[PDB]
């Protein structure tokens, strides 16, 4: 039942969770969005 374990982790470690979200956005954008933007430019 890992959907309140994540809830508990966020409640108890807000700083670590926020850091993971911010850095994960920073990693997700070049990994996913950038190739999409490059593909839309080719066509």
């Amino acid at each position: 039942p890992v959907m309140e374990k994540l809830r508990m982790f966020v409640a108890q470690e807000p700083v670590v969770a926020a850091s993971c979200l911010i850095g994960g956005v920073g990693l997700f954008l070049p990994a996913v969005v950038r190739p999409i933007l490059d593909s839309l430019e080719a066509s």
């Binding site: 700083v15 926020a18 850091s19 911010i22 850095g23 956005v25 920073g26 997700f28 950038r34």
Partner: protein
């Protein structure tokens, strides 16, 4: 080069005056929050208080305890004071108003900050007092701990700007002040500046009542004054750095002719004054952390958040091709 010493003195002397009056302003604001007056007898509105205190200090006999580190004991305050002074060589107050237009100025500031720890360490060790030594060790550890977060925030600004030149960092904020998109980074930077300058709520050397002796407890006369002056000059410098990196330095709030009438040095000064007021206000508002709590905050909160902001800013700017 013959006129260079005149420029250097025109920096150093008004800075020393500004520190002398920052002490008075701290006392005044603290008093007014506390529903009292603060210095108002020595001179009109207490404006002669700093000169009297400095005169008292120079007229005080030096002690120089019978230690085996006679040279080091007096040189430590000299080191910290000189380091506090020399950071201002690269600080621009307006377009073209700067002593040294260093291309590597950001890293130079980081280096000066990293050098600041030695005065405290040497004062603690040379004083021949276990309490001073322990306090100095704790203060040094705190400063090195928060230096990591300061450096990472510097990297975030550098990614946005693409140059280590402080004037270029200012002029890169013509479109928008960096403190608007990076507001949490600015809050983090201000807190890290508080911790790095041993200021409340991080002022361990001020916690004598908490059985925590400061690193300068054995100092008297002008060595103690040198430590104090270096600390307050560093407070002014941290306010200036907050202004440069996030509030657009000498730039006006809005790119309009009405705002462009007033000189850029005045904009820079006003922002610096706001940050100094926040220094005093914070000291007036809150109690202090324990050493262990603030170390935990340094390593467990500010480092991960600073690194995350580095990653997020760089990834976003690379993705949409908004790099400088």
């Amino acid at each position: 080069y013959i006129a260079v010493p005149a420029e250097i003195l025109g920096i150093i002397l008004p800075l020393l005056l500004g520190v002398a009056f920052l002490v008075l302003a701290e006392r005044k604001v603290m008093a007014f929050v506390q529903r009292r007056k603060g210095p108002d007898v020595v001179g009109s509105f207490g404006l002669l208080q700093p000169l009297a205190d400095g005169l008292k200090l120079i007229l005080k006999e030096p002690i120089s305890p019978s230690s085996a580190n006679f040279f080091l004991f007096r040189m430590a305050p000299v080191a910290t004071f000189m380091l506090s002074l020399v950071a201002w060589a690269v600080v621009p107050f307006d377009y073209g108003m700067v002593l040294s237009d260093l291309n590597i100025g950001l890293l130079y500031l980081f280096a000066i900050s990293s050098l600041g720890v030695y005065g405290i360490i040497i004062a603690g060790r040379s004083s021949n007092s276990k309490y001073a030594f322990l306090g100095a060790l704790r203060s040094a550890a705190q400063m090195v701990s928060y230096e990591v977060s300061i450096g990472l925030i510097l990297i975030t600004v550098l990614i946005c700007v693409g140059s280590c030149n402080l004037s270029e960092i200012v002029m890169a904020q013509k479109q928008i002040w960096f403190g608007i998109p990076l507001f949490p980074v600015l809050v983090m930077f201000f807190i890290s500046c508080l911790a790095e300058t041993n200021r409340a709520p991080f002022d361990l050397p001020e916690a004598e009542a908490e059985l925590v002796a400061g690193y300068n407890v054995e100092y008297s006369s002008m060595g103690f004054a040198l430590f104090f002056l270096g600390e307050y000059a560093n407070m002014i410098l941290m306010s200036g750095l907050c202004t440069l990196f996030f509030l657009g330095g000498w730039l006006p709030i809005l790119d309009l002719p009405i705002f462009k009438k007033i000189p850029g040095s005045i904009w820079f000064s006003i922002k610096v004054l706001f940050f100094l007021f926040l220094y005093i206000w914070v000291r007036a508002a809150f109690p202090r952390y324990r050493y262990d709590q603030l170390m935990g905050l340094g390593w467990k909160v500010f480092l991960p958040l600073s690194l995350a902001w580095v990653v997020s800013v760089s990834g976003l700017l690379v993705t949409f091709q908004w790099l400088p």
